[PDB]
């Protein structure tokens, strides 16, 4: 509860890995896939022409 | 779905023309008309006195 008390901005955190929560049954395959969209992130830093 | 992924700002798009979607019946006339209001768009560019 108190873990974020001293953070100035709480938008993001360090990675907390996914777990097979319930995906442990017979013939049950746990996996990960990328999303379909690939968004732009403008103005990460300065550029020129 | 991915068509807007690389846009910085998605407020407007290029024109996609209207179609007579269902307005193809006997004695059914498809048309277009202007709206009643004519709004101001201030500060399109600099001016002076």
């Amino acid at each position: 509860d108190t873990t974020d008390d001293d953070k100035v901005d709480t938008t993001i955190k360090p990675v907390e890995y996914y777990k097979p929560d319930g995906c442990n049954k017979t013939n049950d395959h746990f996996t990960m896939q990328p999303g379909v969209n690939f968004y732009t992130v403008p103005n990460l830093g300065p550029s020129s022409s | 779905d991915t068509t807007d992924d690389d846009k910085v700002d998605t407020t407007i798009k290029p024109v996609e023309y209207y179609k007579p979607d269902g307005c193809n019946k006997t004695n059914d006339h498809f048309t277009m008309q202007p709206g009643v209001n004519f709004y101001t768009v201030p500060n399109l560019g600099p001016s002076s006195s």
Binding site: - | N27, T31, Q33, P34, G35, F38, T40, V41
Partner: protein, 34 residues
């Protein structure tokens, strides 16, 4: 929906200098049964 912007030259008052103005409107799709 389709919106349009019109840019025009003119004068607000008779004695004013010429200036450029801009206004916007929309096109409304309509379908009439005769």
């Amino acid at each position: 929906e389709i919106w349009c912007i019109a840019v025009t030259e003119g004068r607000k008052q008779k004695e004013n200098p010429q200036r450029i103005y801009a206004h916007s409107y929309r096109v409304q799709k309509m379908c009439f049964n005769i």
